[PDB]
Coordinates of C-alpha atoms in Angstrom, one line a residue:
Chain A
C10 CA 66.5 109.5 131.9
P11 CA 65.0 111.3 128.7
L12 CA 68.5 112.3 127.3
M13 CA 71.7 109.9 127.3
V14 CA 74.9 110.5 125.7
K15 CA 77.2 107.7 124.4
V16 CA 80.9 108.4 122.5
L17 CA 83.0 105.9 120.8
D18 CA 86.8 106.1 119.8
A19 CA 87.2 104.9 115.9
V20 CA 91.0 105.1 116.4
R21 CA 91.3 102.7 119.6
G22 CA 88.0 100.8 119.0
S23 CA 86.8 101.4 122.4
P24 CA 84.1 103.3 124.4
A25 CA 85.3 107.6 124.5
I26 CA 85.8 107.7 128.7
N27 CA 86.4 110.9 130.7
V28 CA 84.8 113.0 128.0
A29 CA 83.4 116.1 129.1
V30 CA 79.8 117.1 127.6
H31 CA 78.1 120.4 128.2
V32 CA 74.2 120.7 127.3
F33 CA 72.5 124.0 126.6
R34 CA 69.1 125.5 126.3
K35 CA 68.0 128.0 123.8
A36 CA 66.9 130.8 125.9
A37 CA 64.1 133.3 124.6
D38 CA 66.6 135.8 123.5
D39 CA 68.7 133.5 121.5
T40 CA 71.7 132.8 123.8
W41 CA 72.5 129.3 124.8
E42 CA 71.5 128.8 128.4
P43 CA 73.5 126.1 130.6
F44 CA 71.4 123.1 131.0
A45 CA 73.3 119.9 132.1
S46 CA 76.9 118.4 131.8
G47 CA 78.9 115.7 133.0
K48 CA 82.0 113.3 131.8
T49 CA 81.3 110.0 130.2
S50 CA 81.9 106.8 132.2
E51 CA 84.0 104.0 131.4
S52 CA 81.2 102.4 129.2
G53 CA 81.6 105.9 127.2
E54 CA 78.4 106.6 128.4
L55 CA 76.7 109.8 130.4
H56 CA 73.5 109.0 132.0
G57 CA 71.5 111.5 134.4
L58 CA 71.9 114.6 132.6
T59 CA 68.2 115.7 133.1
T60 CA 64.9 114.5 134.4
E61 CA 61.6 114.3 132.7
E62 CA 60.3 117.2 134.6
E63 CA 63.3 119.5 133.3
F64 CA 63.7 118.0 129.8
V65 CA 60.8 120.4 128.2
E66 CA 60.3 120.9 124.3
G67 CA 62.7 123.3 122.8
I68 CA 66.1 123.5 121.1
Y69 CA 69.5 122.3 122.9
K70 CA 72.9 121.7 121.9
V71 CA 75.1 119.1 123.1
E72 CA 78.7 120.0 122.9
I73 CA 81.3 117.3 123.4
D74 CA 84.9 118.3 124.2
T75 CA 86.7 116.2 121.6
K76 CA 89.7 118.7 121.4
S77 CA 90.7 117.6 125.3
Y78 CA 90.0 114.0 124.8
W79 CA 92.2 113.4 122.0
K80 CA 95.0 115.9 123.7
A81 CA 95.0 113.7 126.8
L82 CA 95.8 110.9 124.8
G83 CA 98.7 112.4 122.9
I84 CA 96.7 112.8 119.5
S85 CA 96.3 116.2 117.7
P86 CA 92.8 116.9 116.7
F87 CA 90.8 119.2 113.9
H88 CA 87.7 119.8 116.0
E89 CA 87.2 122.4 119.2
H90 CA 84.2 119.8 119.7
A91 CA 81.5 118.1 118.3
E92 CA 78.3 120.1 118.1
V93 CA 74.9 118.1 118.3
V94 CA 72.1 120.7 118.0
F95 CA 68.4 119.5 117.9
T96 CA 64.8 120.2 118.9
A97 CA 63.3 117.9 121.5
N98 CA 59.5 117.1 120.6
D99 CA 56.9 115.8 122.7
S100 CA 55.3 113.9 119.8
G101 CA 58.2 111.7 119.1
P102 CA 59.3 108.6 121.3
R103 CA 60.3 109.4 124.9
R104 CA 64.0 108.7 125.3
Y105 CA 66.8 110.5 123.1
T106 CA 70.2 109.0 122.8
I107 CA 72.6 111.0 121.4
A108 CA 75.6 108.9 119.8
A109 CA 79.0 109.9 118.7
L110 CA 81.9 108.5 116.8
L111 CA 85.2 110.1 117.5
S112 CA 88.3 110.3 114.7
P113 CA 90.9 113.2 115.0
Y114 CA 89.8 114.6 111.6
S115 CA 86.2 113.3 111.3
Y116 CA 83.0 112.4 113.9
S117 CA 79.6 111.1 113.1
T118 CA 76.4 111.6 115.2
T119 CA 73.5 109.6 115.3
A120 CA 70.2 110.2 117.3
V121 CA 68.2 107.2 118.7
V122 CA 64.7 108.2 119.6
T123 CA 62.7 105.3 121.3
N124 CA 60.0 104.1 123.6
Chain B
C10 CA 90.2 128.4 97.3
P11 CA 91.1 128.2 101.0
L12 CA 87.6 126.8 102.1
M13 CA 85.7 124.5 100.7
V14 CA 82.4 122.4 101.7
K15 CA 80.9 119.3 100.0
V16 CA 77.8 118.0 101.1
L17 CA 76.2 114.3 100.1
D18 CA 72.7 112.5 100.8
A19 CA 73.0 109.2 101.9
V20 CA 69.3 108.6 101.5
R21 CA 69.0 109.3 97.8
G22 CA 73.1 108.4 97.0
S23 CA 73.7 111.9 95.7
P24 CA 74.9 115.2 96.0
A25 CA 73.2 117.5 98.5
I26 CA 71.9 120.6 96.3
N27 CA 70.8 123.8 97.4
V28 CA 72.2 123.3 101.0
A29 CA 72.4 126.4 102.6
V30 CA 75.9 127.1 104.8
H31 CA 76.8 129.7 107.1
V32 CA 80.4 130.3 108.6
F33 CA 81.1 132.3 111.5
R34 CA 84.3 133.5 112.9
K35 CA 84.8 133.8 116.8
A36 CA 85.7 137.8 117.6
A37 CA 88.3 139.2 120.0
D38 CA 85.2 139.8 122.4
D39 CA 84.4 135.8 122.2
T40 CA 81.1 136.2 119.9
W41 CA 80.4 134.7 116.7
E42 CA 81.0 137.0 114.1
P43 CA 79.3 136.3 110.4
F44 CA 81.9 135.5 108.1
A45 CA 80.9 134.1 105.0
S46 CA 77.8 132.3 103.6
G47 CA 76.3 130.6 100.3
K48 CA 74.4 127.4 99.1
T49 CA 75.9 124.0 97.5
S50 CA 75.7 123.7 93.8
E51 CA 74.2 120.8 91.7
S52 CA 77.5 118.8 92.5
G53 CA 77.2 119.5 96.3
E54 CA 79.8 121.8 96.3
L55 CA 80.1 125.3 97.7
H56 CA 83.1 127.3 96.5
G57 CA 84.2 130.8 96.9
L58 CA 83.2 131.2 100.3
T59 CA 86.3 133.6 101.2
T60 CA 89.8 134.6 99.9
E61 CA 93.3 133.7 101.0
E62 CA 93.7 137.2 102.4
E63 CA 90.2 137.3 104.0
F64 CA 90.5 133.8 105.9
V65 CA 92.9 134.9 108.6
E66 CA 94.0 132.8 111.9
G67 CA 91.1 132.0 113.9
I68 CA 88.1 129.8 115.6
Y69 CA 85.8 129.1 112.4
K70 CA 82.3 127.7 112.7
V71 CA 80.6 126.2 109.7
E72 CA 77.0 125.4 110.0
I73 CA 75.3 123.5 107.6
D74 CA 71.4 123.9 107.4
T75 CA 70.4 120.4 107.2
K76 CA 66.9 121.0 108.8
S77 CA 66.2 123.6 106.0
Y78 CA 67.6 120.9 103.4
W79 CA 65.4 117.9 104.5
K80 CA 62.0 120.1 105.2
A81 CA 62.7 121.7 101.5
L82 CA 62.6 117.9 100.5
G83 CA 59.1 117.3 102.6
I84 CA 61.2 115.3 105.3
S85 CA 61.4 116.2 109.2
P86 CA 64.7 115.6 110.5
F87 CA 66.3 115.5 113.8
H88 CA 68.8 118.1 113.9
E89 CA 68.6 121.8 113.5
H90 CA 72.0 121.9 111.8
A91 CA 75.3 120.4 111.4
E92 CA 78.1 122.5 113.1
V93 CA 82.0 122.3 112.6
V94 CA 84.1 124.0 114.8
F95 CA 87.6 124.6 114.2
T96 CA 91.1 126.4 114.6
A97 CA 92.2 127.5 110.9
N98 CA 95.5 129.0 109.8
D99 CA 97.2 128.4 112.9
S100 CA 100.7 126.9 111.2
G101 CA 100.0 129.4 108.3
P102 CA 97.6 129.3 105.4
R103 CA 95.7 125.9 104.6
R104 CA 93.4 124.6 102.5
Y105 CA 90.2 123.0 104.2
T106 CA 87.4 121.1 102.6
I107 CA 84.6 120.1 105.1
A108 CA 82.7 117.4 103.8
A109 CA 79.2 116.2 105.3
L110 CA 77.1 113.2 104.7
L111 CA 73.6 113.8 105.6
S112 CA 70.7 111.2 106.8
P113 CA 67.6 112.3 108.3
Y114 CA 68.9 111.3 111.9
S115 CA 72.5 111.4 111.4
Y116 CA 75.2 113.0 110.0
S117 CA 79.1 113.0 109.8
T118 CA 81.9 115.4 109.0
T119 CA 85.4 115.0 107.6
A120 CA 88.0 117.6 107.3
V121 CA 90.3 117.3 104.5
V122 CA 93.2 119.9 105.1
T123 CA 96.0 120.0 102.5
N124 CA 99.2 122.5 102.3
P125 CA 99.7 124.1 98.7
Chain C
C10 CA 84.3 106.5 84.0
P11 CA 81.5 104.7 85.1
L12 CA 83.1 103.3 88.4
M13 CA 85.4 105.4 90.7
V14 CA 86.7 105.0 94.1
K15 CA 87.5 107.7 96.7
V16 CA 89.1 107.1 99.8
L17 CA 89.9 109.5 102.7
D18 CA 91.8 109.0 106.2
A19 CA 89.9 110.2 109.0
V20 CA 92.9 110.3 111.4
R21 CA 95.0 112.5 109.4
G22 CA 92.2 114.5 107.2
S23 CA 93.8 113.6 104.1
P24 CA 93.5 111.5 100.9
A25 CA 94.1 108.0 101.6
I26 CA 96.8 107.3 98.8
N27 CA 98.5 104.1 97.6
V28 CA 95.2 101.7 98.7
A29 CA 94.6 98.5 96.8
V30 CA 91.3 98.0 95.5
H31 CA 90.1 94.7 94.0
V32 CA 86.6 94.6 92.3
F33 CA 84.5 91.2 91.5
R34 CA 81.7 90.2 89.9
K35 CA 79.1 87.6 90.7
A36 CA 79.4 85.0 87.8
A37 CA 76.7 82.7 86.5
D38 CA 77.9 79.8 88.9
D39 CA 77.7 82.2 91.6
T40 CA 81.4 82.8 92.3
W41 CA 83.2 85.9 92.5
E42 CA 85.3 86.7 89.6
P43 CA 87.8 89.1 89.5
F44 CA 86.7 92.0 87.3
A45 CA 89.2 95.2 87.9
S46 CA 91.7 96.4 90.1
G47 CA 93.8 99.5 90.9
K48 CA 95.5 101.8 93.5
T49 CA 94.5 105.1 94.8
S50 CA 96.2 107.8 93.5
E51 CA 97.7 111.1 95.7
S52 CA 94.1 112.7 95.7
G53 CA 92.7 109.3 97.4
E54 CA 90.8 108.8 93.9
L55 CA 91.0 105.4 91.7
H56 CA 89.8 106.0 87.9
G57 CA 89.9 104.0 84.9
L58 CA 89.2 100.5 86.6
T59 CA 86.6 99.6 83.7
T60 CA 84.8 100.9 80.6
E61 CA 81.2 101.3 80.1
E62 CA 81.1 98.7 77.4
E63 CA 82.6 96.1 80.1
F64 CA 80.9 97.4 83.2
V65 CA 77.5 95.1 82.3
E66 CA 74.7 94.5 84.5
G67 CA 75.6 92.1 87.7
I68 CA 76.4 92.1 91.4
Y69 CA 79.7 93.6 92.1
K70 CA 82.1 93.7 95.1
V71 CA 84.7 96.4 95.9
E72 CA 87.5 95.4 98.2
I73 CA 89.3 98.0 99.9
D74 CA 92.1 96.5 101.5
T75 CA 92.2 98.9 104.7
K76 CA 94.3 96.5 106.7
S77 CA 97.2 96.9 104.0
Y78 CA 97.0 100.5 104.1
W79 CA 96.9 101.1 107.8
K80 CA 100.0 98.3 108.1
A81 CA 102.1 100.1 105.6
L82 CA 101.6 103.2 107.6
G83 CA 102.8 101.1 111.0
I84 CA 99.3 100.8 112.5
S85 CA 97.5 97.7 113.4
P86 CA 93.8 98.1 112.2
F87 CA 90.7 96.2 113.1
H88 CA 89.4 95.1 109.6
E89 CA 90.7 92.9 107.1
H90 CA 89.0 95.0 104.2
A91 CA 86.1 97.2 103.5
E92 CA 83.9 95.4 101.2
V93 CA 80.9 97.3 99.2
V94 CA 78.6 94.9 97.5
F95 CA 75.6 96.0 95.1
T96 CA 73.7 95.5 92.0
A97 CA 74.8 97.8 89.2
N98 CA 73.4 98.8 86.0
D99 CA 70.4 97.2 86.7
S100 CA 68.2 99.9 85.2
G101 CA 70.6 100.8 82.3
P102 CA 74.4 102.2 82.8
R103 CA 74.8 104.5 85.5
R104 CA 78.1 106.3 87.2
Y105 CA 79.2 104.9 90.5
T106 CA 81.3 106.7 92.9
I107 CA 82.3 104.2 95.9
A108 CA 83.3 106.7 98.9
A109 CA 85.2 105.2 101.9
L110 CA 86.2 106.9 105.1
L111 CA 88.9 105.0 106.9
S112 CA 89.7 105.1 110.6
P113 CA 91.7 102.0 112.5
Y114 CA 88.8 100.8 114.1
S115 CA 86.0 101.7 111.5
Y116 CA 84.9 103.0 108.6
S117 CA 82.3 104.3 106.4
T118 CA 81.0 104.0 103.0
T119 CA 78.8 106.2 100.6
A120 CA 77.5 105.7 96.8
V121 CA 77.0 108.3 94.6
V122 CA 75.1 107.0 91.7
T123 CA 74.2 109.4 89.0
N124 CA 72.8 109.3 85.4
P125 CA 74.9 110.5 82.6
Chain D
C10 CA 79.5 86.4 124.9
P11 CA 82.6 87.1 122.7
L12 CA 80.7 88.5 119.6
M13 CA 77.6 91.1 119.8
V14 CA 76.4 93.0 116.7
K15 CA 74.1 96.2 117.0
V16 CA 72.6 97.7 114.1
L17 CA 71.1 101.4 114.0
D18 CA 68.4 103.0 111.5
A19 CA 69.9 106.7 110.3
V20 CA 67.0 107.2 108.4
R21 CA 64.1 106.8 111.5
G22 CA 66.7 107.4 114.1
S23 CA 66.1 103.7 115.9
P24 CA 67.5 100.6 116.6
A25 CA 67.2 98.5 113.4
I26 CA 64.8 95.5 114.3
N27 CA 64.6 92.1 112.6
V28 CA 68.0 92.6 110.6
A29 CA 69.1 89.0 109.5
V30 CA 72.9 88.8 110.4
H31 CA 74.9 86.0 109.3
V32 CA 78.9 85.1 110.5
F33 CA 81.4 83.3 109.0
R34 CA 84.8 81.4 109.7
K35 CA 87.2 81.4 107.0
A36 CA 88.4 77.9 106.7
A37 CA 91.8 76.4 105.6
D38 CA 90.5 76.3 102.0
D39 CA 90.0 80.0 101.8
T40 CA 85.8 79.2 101.9
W41 CA 83.5 80.9 104.1
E42 CA 82.3 78.5 106.9
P43 CA 78.8 79.3 108.3
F44 CA 79.6 79.9 112.0
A45 CA 76.5 81.5 113.6
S46 CA 73.4 83.7 112.9
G47 CA 70.9 85.3 114.4
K48 CA 68.1 88.3 113.8
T49 CA 68.6 91.7 115.7
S50 CA 65.9 92.3 118.6
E51 CA 63.8 95.1 119.2
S52 CA 67.0 97.0 120.4
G53 CA 68.9 96.3 117.6
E54 CA 71.4 94.2 119.0
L55 CA 72.0 90.7 118.7
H56 CA 73.4 88.6 121.4
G57 CA 74.1 84.8 122.1
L58 CA 75.8 84.1 118.6
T59 CA 78.6 82.0 120.0
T60 CA 80.8 81.3 122.8
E61 CA 84.4 81.5 124.1
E62 CA 84.8 77.7 123.6
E63 CA 83.8 78.1 120.0
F64 CA 85.3 81.7 119.2
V65 CA 88.8 80.9 118.4
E66 CA 91.5 82.8 116.7
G67 CA 91.0 83.2 113.1
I68 CA 89.2 85.9 110.0
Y69 CA 85.6 86.2 110.5
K70 CA 83.0 87.9 108.1
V71 CA 79.6 89.5 109.7
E72 CA 77.4 89.5 107.2
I73 CA 74.2 92.0 107.6
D74 CA 71.4 91.7 105.4
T75 CA 70.7 95.9 104.8
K76 CA 69.0 94.9 101.5
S77 CA 65.7 93.0 103.2
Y78 CA 65.8 95.4 106.0
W79 CA 65.4 98.7 103.6
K80 CA 62.9 96.4 101.3
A81 CA 60.3 95.5 104.4
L82 CA 60.4 99.0 105.1
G83 CA 59.5 100.4 101.6
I84 CA 62.8 101.9 100.9
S85 CA 64.8 101.2 98.0
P86 CA 68.3 100.5 98.9
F87 CA 71.7 100.3 97.1
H88 CA 73.7 97.6 98.8
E89 CA 73.1 93.7 98.7
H90 CA 74.5 93.5 102.1
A91 CA 77.1 95.0 104.8
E92 CA 80.1 92.8 105.3
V93 CA 82.3 93.3 108.4
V94 CA 85.7 91.6 107.8
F95 CA 88.2 91.1 110.8
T96 CA 90.8 88.9 112.3
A97 CA 89.8 87.9 116.1
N98 CA 92.9 88.1 118.4
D99 CA 93.3 87.0 121.6
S100 CA 96.1 89.5 122.4
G101 CA 93.2 91.9 122.6
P102 CA 90.5 92.4 125.0
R103 CA 88.0 89.9 125.4
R104 CA 84.5 91.2 124.1
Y105 CA 84.0 92.3 120.4
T106 CA 81.1 94.4 120.0
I107 CA 80.4 94.9 115.8
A108 CA 78.3 98.2 115.3
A109 CA 76.6 99.1 112.0
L110 CA 74.7 102.4 110.9
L111 CA 72.4 101.8 108.4
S112 CA 71.0 104.5 105.6
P113 CA 69.9 103.6 102.1
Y114 CA 73.2 104.3 100.3
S115 CA 75.6 104.5 102.9
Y116 CA 76.8 102.6 106.1
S117 CA 79.1 102.8 108.6
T118 CA 80.5 100.2 111.0
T119 CA 82.6 100.2 114.1
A120 CA 84.6 97.7 116.4
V121 CA 84.2 98.1 120.2
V122 CA 86.8 95.8 121.8
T123 CA 86.8 95.8 125.4
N124 CA 87.5 94.1 128.8

């Protein structure tokens, strides 16, 4: 899998489980075309989003539905979602790991790009 | 000032200066309408984006053009930009500070929301 | 003010108020000597820890008592405290801001270093 | 392993490899007693630090030699090291993952405590 997403919960110190994640690919007319989606597992990870054949160079948006996650845990959140926007580049390593660390009023994201 | 943005550079340990910021608001028809824009100062702060009157209830997106910033410094970063999407003024007028901390392959964003 | 500390609360999206902070400096004999201490204000900032004259070259440790803060709020966090260890004034006097962002199981710290 | 450490590099978007990590346990007289140590692998992870038998309740310090890491990559760092200080508690889940994300002038750490 060339594209993995991993989400952690900074309040509970745990993987963020059952978080919905939507990936889009920027179309020629600048609209965001649905590309892949899933929900994080019990390890807070989401594998199998796409394949090497399908994951061509281009601009992608990974949308993490953090609002719904916090709501289901009874906690009031600030953001509608977390958004990660990046260009996939064949010149760089082959596997992209998009990691996100969630708090109610803050989040951080990190790209781990490896061979 | 009901909406402020502060940006830091985690590589240099300094304010991130001349960072372009674009703010949008979700319209009735569900598209992102331009709302306000500006660039961070030598302190890494962006003030005067909008006014109390104009900053009504809505869903706002604050786009911080981190790629433009890093490339202007001769560096090739991972992200196109940092996007911060939030409902604002849903319980009456608040003051929002959107803070961001920038590294070439990583960023974090925080919101400080106060009631004047 | 050559050494400032700013602390935010990532759960509430607010300044972290009344956070105890203890600063130490590594002594000739390699032990941590007490240097300065204080508590963050309603803005989450701690000013006036030390003076230009007293803040000499050295290795400093800024201990932010995050456990005391969370427990005072009726919350059981993971860390005892957040420790920030750095050489200071090695190239002459600088101004340091140590920023921290607090969650119950996580924190981040940033240094902004300026030359007056 | 009840105690794992994982380190990432926010500048290169990669695991932080060959980072020295020292763990200490607080002794009765308040001194820090060496407990375990190692160097992160090519995945930026360090396994096998200790065992369930050895990892008793108490206060621990995980020291991550970030200064040396940045130096070896030709980059000027701010911190002497990153320090993570915490109480190990038998009332909580069994596996502690101490994660750290490194920049020259900033770092974040997160505890992932699971079953």
